[PDB]
C-alpha cells in the first residue's frame, strides 16, 4: 500500500503477512457472505491495484465466482476505456500519461507508475475506481450466490 511516512510524505510499504492471512481466513470462513464487502473495504485501505490483483490471485477455491469477477473487472475496464477516450496528440515531457482500464486493473502499469498517479498533484483515485468494480462484481456474486 501507499502510506504516509513520519517525515510527512506518501511512500509505498508492503502489506503485512497476518493482514494477508486475515484476508485468506475471511474468505475461508464467510465465502460469499455480505460481511466480506466492508471487511474487504477496511483491509483495502490505501491499497494499490497491484495489491488488489495479489489479493484476487491468492484466492483458492470458488473458481466459478473468481472467473465471473475477472470477466466483470474486464467489462468494467472496457467501459473505462469507452467512456474516457485517449487524449489529444502526443504525451507532454513535463507530464505523465493518462491511465487506461488495464492501468486501473494494474495490468499495464508498473508500481512506480501507480505511485506517480496517486501521489502526484492532483492525484487520481485508480484504487477507488477498481474498488467500485470489485464491490459491483461482489454484488453480482452475492446476488447469484443467494439460494
Amino acid at each position: 500500500p501507499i502510506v504516509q511516512n513520519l517525515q510527512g510524505q506518501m511512500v509505498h510499504q508492503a502489506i503485512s503477512p497476518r493482514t494477508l492471512n486475515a484476508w485468506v481466513k475471511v474468505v475461508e470462513e464467510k465465502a460469499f457472505s455480505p460481511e466480506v464487502i466492508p471487511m474487504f473495504s477496511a483491509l483495502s485501505e490505501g491499497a494499490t491495484p497491484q495489491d488488489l490483483n495479489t489479493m484476487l490471485n491468492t484466492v483458492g477455491g470458488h473458481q466459478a465466482a473468481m472467473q465471473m469477477l475477472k470477466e466483470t473487472i474486464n467489462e468494467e475496464a472496457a467501459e473505462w476505456d469507452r467512456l474516457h477516450p485517449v487524449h489529444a496528440g502526443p504525451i507532454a515531457p513535463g507530464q505523465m500519461r493518462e491511465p487506461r482500464g488495464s492501468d486501473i486493473a494494474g495490468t499495464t502499469s508498473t508500481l512506480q507508475e501507480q505511485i506517480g498517479w496517486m501521489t502526484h498533484n492532483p492525484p487520481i483515485p485508480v484504487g477507488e475506481i477498481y474498488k467500485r468494480w470489485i464491490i459491483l462484481g461482489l454484488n453480482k456474486i452475492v446476488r447469484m450466490y443467494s439460494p
Partner: protein, 74 residues
C-alpha cells in the same frame, strides 16, 4: 434462496425466523422504501398461524421488541 421462500415453521420460534428474514433482507439490495414494504408485509404473511393470530392483535404501528416479546410463548 429467494426472500419469498423465507417462511416460519409450524414449531419454529418466530425469533429464529426473524433472524433468517433480516439475513436474507441483508442480501437484498432494493431501495429502502421497498425494503420497508417487505418488512411490514412479508414477515407477517409468512409467519405461522399461531403467531400470525398474535401479530394481528398487536395492530399496526408495532415495533420489533414488542413483536418479538409478543410471539415468545408460541
Amino acid at each position: 434462496t429467494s426472500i419469498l421462500d423465507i417462511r416460519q415453521g409450524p414449531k419454529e420460534p418466530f425469533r429464529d425466523y426473524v433472524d433468517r428474514f433480516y439475513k436474507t433482507l441483508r442480501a437484498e439490495q432494493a431501495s429502502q422504501e421497498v425494503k420497508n414494504w417487505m418488512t411490514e408485509t412479508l414477515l407477517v404473511q409468512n409467519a405461522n398461524p399461531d403467531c400470525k393470530t398474535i401479530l394481528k392483535a398487536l395492530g399496526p404501528g408495532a415495533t420489533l421488541e414488542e413483536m418479538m416479546t409478543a410471539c415468545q410463548g408460541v
